[PDB]
Amino acid sequence: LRSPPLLVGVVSDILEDGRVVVKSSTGPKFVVNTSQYINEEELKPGARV
Amino acid sequence: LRSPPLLVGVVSDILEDGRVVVKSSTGPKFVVNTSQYINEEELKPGARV
Amino acid sequence: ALNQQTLAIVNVLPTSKDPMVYGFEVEEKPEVSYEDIGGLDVQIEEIRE
Amino acid sequence: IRVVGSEFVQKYIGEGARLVREVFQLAKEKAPSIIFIDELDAIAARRTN
Amino acid sequence: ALNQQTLAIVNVLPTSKDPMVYGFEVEEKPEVSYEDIGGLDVQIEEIREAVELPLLKPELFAEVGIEPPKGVLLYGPPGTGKTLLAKAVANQTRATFIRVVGSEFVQKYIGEGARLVREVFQLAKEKAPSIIFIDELDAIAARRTNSDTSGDREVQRTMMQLLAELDGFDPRGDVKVIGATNRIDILDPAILRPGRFDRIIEVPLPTFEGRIQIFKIHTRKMKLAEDVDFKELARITEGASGADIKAICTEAGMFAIREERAKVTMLDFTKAIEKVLKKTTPIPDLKGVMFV
Amino acid sequence: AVELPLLKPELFAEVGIEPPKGVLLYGPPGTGKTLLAKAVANQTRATFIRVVGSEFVQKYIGEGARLVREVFQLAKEKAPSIIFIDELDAIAARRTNSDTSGDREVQRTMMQLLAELDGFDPRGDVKVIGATNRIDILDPAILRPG
Numbered sequence: 001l002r003s004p005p006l007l008v009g010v011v012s013d014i015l016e017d018g019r020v021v022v023k024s025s026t027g028p029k030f031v032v033n034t035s036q037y038i039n040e041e042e043l044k045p046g047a048r049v
Numbered sequence: 050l051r052s053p054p055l056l057v058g059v060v061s062d063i064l065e066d067g068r069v070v071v072k073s074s075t076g077p078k079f080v081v082n083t084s085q086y087i088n089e090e091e092l093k094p095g096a097r098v
Numbered sequence: 099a100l101n102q103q104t105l106a107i108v109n110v111l112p113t114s115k116d117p118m119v120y121g122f123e124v125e126e127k128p129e130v131s132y133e134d135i136g137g138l139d140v141q142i143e144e145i146r147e
Numbered sequence: 148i149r150v151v152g153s154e155f156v157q158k159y160i161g162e163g164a165r166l167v168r169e170v171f172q173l174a175k176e177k178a179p180s181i182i183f184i185d186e187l188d189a190i191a192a193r194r195t196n
Numbered sequence: 197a198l199n200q201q202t203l204a205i206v207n208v209l210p211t212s213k214d215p216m217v218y219g220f221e222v223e224e225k226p227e228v229s230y231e232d233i234g235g236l237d238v239q240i241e242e243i244r245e246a247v248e249l250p251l252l253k254p255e256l257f258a259e260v261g262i263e264p265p266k267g268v269l270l271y272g273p274p275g276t277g278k279t280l281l282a283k284a285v286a287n288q289t290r291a292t293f294i295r296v297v298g299s300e301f302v303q304k305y306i307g308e309g310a311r312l313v314r315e316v317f318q319l320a321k322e323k324a325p326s327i328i329f330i331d332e333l334d335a336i337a338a339r340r341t342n343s344d345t346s347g348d349r350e351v352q353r354t355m356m357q358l359l360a361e362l363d364g365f366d367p368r369g370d371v372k373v374i375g376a377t378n379r380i381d382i383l384d385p386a387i388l389r390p391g392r393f394d395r396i397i398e399v400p401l402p403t404f405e406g407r408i409q410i411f412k413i414h415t416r417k418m419k420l421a422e423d424v425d426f427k428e429l430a431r432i433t434e435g436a437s438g439a440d441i442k443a444i445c446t447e448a449g450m451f452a453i454r455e456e457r458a459k460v461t462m463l464d465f466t467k468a469i470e471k472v473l474k475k476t477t478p479i480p481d482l483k484g485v486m487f488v
Numbered sequence: 489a490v491e492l493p494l495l496k497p498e499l500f501a502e503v504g505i506e507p508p509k510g511v512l513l514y515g516p517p518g519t520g521k522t523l524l525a526k527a528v529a530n531q532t533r534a535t536f537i538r539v540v541g542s543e544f545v546q547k548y549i550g551e552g553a554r555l556v557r558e559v560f561q562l563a564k565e566k567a568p569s570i571i572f573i574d575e576l577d578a579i580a581a582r583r584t585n586s587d588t589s590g591d592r593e594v595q596r597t598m599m600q601l602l603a604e605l606d607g608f609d610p611r612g613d614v615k616v617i618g619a620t621n622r623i624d625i626l627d628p629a630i631l632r633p634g
């Protein structure tokens with residue numbers, strides 16, 4: 001995962017069900033689940049990831 | 050329902066090397082060949098094909 | 099709606115798209131009625147003729 | 148269908164003529180129809196010879 | 197939620213924001229109140245009756261029989277203090293002040309964008325009572341090119357989505373739409389159409405009485421040694437805007453620094469007006485040799 | 489106007505007036521208006537943002553808008569800082585009415601500039617220094633001091 005291919009997406013909003021809406025720079029927004037490799041406190045609308 | 054898809058384009062220019070460049074309505078430009086029933090006498094630049 | 103692995107039509111979708119008003123304001127069947135205007139009684143009777 | 152007298156006319160013209168053509172077009176399409184045409188003292192006026 | 201490889205509904209997703217909506221509120225109430233804005237004096241009451249009053253009680257507006265505003269324009273010169281009236285409303289309505297630029301609903305590709313115009317009003321409805329100010333409509337009330345094609349469809353769609361929504365979420369206060377414009381004689385009716393908005397508040401560069409109060413409020417914070425009269429200055433700077441009056445106050449005090457002083461005096465002001473007013477609509481200097 | 493409140497905000501504070509929000513420069517071209525701007529840049533040393541008003545506005549609508557948000561947003565974090573935008577007639581120039589293809593985009597850009605300056609937003613200590621080639625080719629809004 002830490003290797004490329006990697007893609008910058010920028011957080012759209014953060015859901016409390018345990019998912020994150022990320023607006024990708026490709027185009028589409030998508031819902032992906034949280035991990036213990038992040039903090040959602042650090043995540044914010046406009047957080048690069 | 051299974052009817053094949055044909056891309057639409059308009060002739061950009063007619064080349065003298067027996068091929069025609071037809072710019073699709075998808076976006077890209079392509080050098081396309083031709084069928085043995087269709088000829089360059091029936092095409093003009095800005096001809097829909 | 100197209101079966102998108104051949105891009106051929108499989109179904110006409112009812113509603114058929116909501117139209118977009120141009121030449122605004124357009125009021126198809128106006129709510130202002132002749133009872134909703136008084137004092138120009140004689141002008142009503144003329145414009146009707 | 149209301150076209151106001153405010154849209155009508157520009158400093159040089161062509162777009163002003165299109166919208167007369169526009170309401171004529173809708174009226175045919177959407178018959179019976181009453182085309183309100185204000186304010187005819189800023190788009191009609193004295194001829195010059 | 198749809199799946200990538202199959203596209204089937206599996207869940208619902210509750211939307212309330214995207215990054216753009218997040219930067220539009222809240223600033224937890226500005227530093228401007230009607231305390232910090234001088235007189236106009238009548239147009240203060242009007243803007244209050246148009247917004248603030250139906251907000252607390254659409255029941256009383258309906259009961260009577262009268263239609264509240266369907267949208268509010270402030271129209272008048274720049275710098276008369278309009279976006280300035282909008283912060284004031286924000287402090288006392290206590291109703292979430294959405295600040296958005298009408299330039300941001302028209303964007304590079306399509307339903308970035310158009311989706312955004314309907315998004316601001318969805319927000320509005322759950323956050324209610326509210327209080328959406330959009331702000332100098334010159335890109336959401338623009339005339340149609342016919343056509344610029346990349347540009348024009350965006351401006352045309354987004355224009356229509358504003359007007360149609362306000363018409364329909366307001367018979368009575370619920371979401372109040374408020375706004376402002378610099379110019380409107382540059383563009384065609386859309387918000388100057390009386391079948392959409394119907395309340396346009398004329399807000400003009402200020403009356404005699406208005407001018408004095410603005411000088412008073414600016415000078416309130418200024419250190420002074422008294423021989424000053426605000427009323428005389430007010431006469432000289434007749435025909436100037438509220439921001440010209442501010443610009444003179446800021447120069448009179450800089451002038452004081454040059455004098456080696458921090459108290460402002462009537463002399464300091466009169467010089468300060470001369471500099472400014474002269475770079476501005478003019479000062480007389482002859483009444484003919486055939487008149488006095 | 490600039491070097492003085494940037495380098496010593498205390499003295500404007502003591503009188504009770506606000507610091508300056510800017511300087512507009514006009515008159516005859518070639519008198520050294522942008523030269524002067526490079527002159528103050530060498531002595532402020534407090535982060536000199538250099539843009540040009542014809543480097544604002546790009547090929548799709550709202551990318552320009554995006555650019556104007558992008559200079560001010562950066563400037564609030566470095567503040568004090570100098571945003572010197574070379575032409576303000578290149579982002580907002582007087583019209584009778586728009587005629588519309590290229591003309592409309594101009595007022596679109598203008599809306600974005602107002603807003604941030606102290607339109608509504610905190611300005612920090614910017615200090616947007618303008619210039620124009622010709623005396624009157626701006627709008628009243630820019631012309632107006634404040």
Ligand SMILES: Nc1ncnc2c1ncn2[C@@H]1O[C@H](COP(=O)(O)OP(=O)(O)OP(=O)(O)O)[C@@H](O)[C@H]1O
Binds near residue numbers: 234274277608
């Ligand atoms: N009546 C007033 N009371 C206090 N400050 C005022 C008054 N009117 C104007 N000002 C001052 O004028 C400046 C604010 O101008 P502002 O940007 O709010 O303008 P606007 O009329 O909404 O303009 P635009 O047409 O450019 O969008 C500030 O310096 C503000 O203090």
Ligand SMILES: Nc1ncnc2c1ncn2[C@@H]1O[C@H](COP(=O)(O)OP(=O)(O)OP(=O)(O)O)[C@@H](O)[C@H]1O
Binds near residue numbers: 519520524619
């Ligand atoms: N006071 C001066 N002493 C010497 N040269 C100067 C002086 N003022 C300006 N110049 C020179 O004049 C030329 C043009 O001036 P500069 O490019 O700074 O002008 P401007 O008034 O901002 O113009 P534009 O309308 O083209 O944007 C430069 O070569 C500059 O160095």
Ligand SMILES: [Mg+2]
Binds near residue numbers: 376
């Ligand atoms: Mg304003």
Ligand SMILES: [Mg+2]
Binds near residue numbers: 522619
């Ligand atoms: Mg120059």
